[PDB]
């Protein structure tokens, strides 16, 4: 077993009670060791709710009916040690992610150390005028600044997209379009933290 598999098997139920400990360790038993070939499984949990799993040696992606998507991976803290990065994304009513960090023994770490959430202005197009009619009309709709994160399956990188634009009324979208960009921002894990690329 790889390190992610080890951590997943020993994750306390209370840390992520999507399935019971026994359901989890029985799922993994039927899976056998996690490899480069993603293993798909689905379960109706005794806890309530259907859960699907993608189990790979380098990432686990879970879909739930309650908390949304949970995506987790190991990231190198040094060349000898690791931390667990878990990205949990509600998909409705508007896609919005939380990034959590843990030690490999499931001790919670303060996220600020590894990740700084971008401001909505980071998603602005060039030459944005903060006194423009368009900006002033949309300003109050820019917050809550929902953002959806996708951590890569295969490199130590992530992309984050603002999901404010989809929240706007149809008559607002043309005003927002002059300054609010749908292009995702990319970050790379470099020496124990995410850095904007």
Taken as a whole, the chain contains a residue count of 197
Structure resolution, Å: 1.8
Which stretch of DSSP H or E encloses residue 100? strand 96-103
Contact 9, 27 (CB under 8 A): no
Nearest C-alpha neighbor of 86 from the set 18, 39, 186, 32 = 18
- CA 45/CA 19 separation, integer angstroms: 6
Q: How was this structure determined?
A: X-ray
Range of the domain at 137: 1-197
Question: How many domains are contained in the chain?
Answer: 1
Question: Is 181 labelled as part of a ligand binding site?
Answer: no
CA-CA distances (angstroms) from residue 160 to 51, 144, 194? Answer: 25, 15, 12
């Amino acid at each position: 077993a790889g390190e992610l598999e080890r951590c997943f098997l020993a994750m306390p139920e209370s840390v992520l009670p999507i399935v019971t400990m026994e359901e989890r360790n029985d799922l993994c038993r039927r899976a056998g060791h996690l490899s480069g070939f993603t293993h798909t499984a689905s379960l109706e949990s005794s806890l309530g709710g259907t859960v699907t799993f993608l189990l790979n040696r380098n990432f686990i992606r879970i879909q739930t009916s309650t908390v949304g998507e949970v995506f987790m991976r190991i990231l190198p803290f040094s060349d000898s040690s690791s931390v667990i990065c878990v990205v949990t994304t509600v998909l409705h009513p508007v896609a919005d992610s939380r990034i959590d960090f843990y030690t490999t023994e499931w001790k919670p770490l303060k996220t600020d150390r590894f990740w700084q959430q971008p401001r909505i202005e980071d998603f602005f197009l060039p030459h944005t005028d903060r006194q423009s009619y368009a900006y002033q009309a949309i300003y109050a709709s820019l917050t809550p600044s929902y953002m959806q994160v996708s951590l890569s399956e295969e490199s130590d990188t992530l992309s984050i997209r603002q999901t404010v634009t989809e929240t706007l009324a149809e008559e607002e979208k043309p005003l927002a379009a002059i300054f609010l960009s749908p292009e995702p921002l990319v970050y790379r894990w470099q020496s124990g933290r995410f850095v904007r690329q």
